[PDB]
Amino acid sequence: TQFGSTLQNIIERQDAEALNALLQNQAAELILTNLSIQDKTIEELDAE
Amino acid sequence: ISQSETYRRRRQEWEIQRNNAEAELKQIDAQLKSLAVRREAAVLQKTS
Numbered sequence: 001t002q003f004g005s006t007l008q009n010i011i012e013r014q015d016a017e018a019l020n021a022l023l024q025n026q027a028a029e030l031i032l033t034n035l036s037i038q039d040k041t042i043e044e045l046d047a048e
Numbered sequence: 049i050s051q052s053e054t055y056r057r058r059r060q061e062w063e064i065q066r067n068n069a070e071a072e073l074k075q076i077d078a079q080l081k082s083l084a085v086r087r088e089a090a091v092l093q094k095t096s
Contacts, residue, residue: 033096040089047082 030096033092037089037092037096040085040092044082044085044089047078047085
């Protein structure tokens with residue numbers, strides 16, 4: 001039962017790690033989109 | 049001569065007023081173009 005508890009903790013921790021990696025990858029994608037948006041903003045000002 | 053000059057002066061006034069309209073017709077396109085850019089930025093916001 002101690003191995004049982006240890007394993008459960010590893011599993012929950014393993015999943016937590018996977019989530020943090022997922023969230024950071026997702027953040028990177030939104031930033032790239034935001035960079036494209038900002039470029040258009042700059043072009044808009046040049047158009048003005 | 050004064051009658052001929054009267055018509056020349058009238059023409060000059062018309063030239064200025066058509067030129068004012070002419071400028072508006074170019075500024076407006078530049079505004080349509082900045083709007084088009086603004087629209088594309090909004091499209092990217094939808095993409096985000």
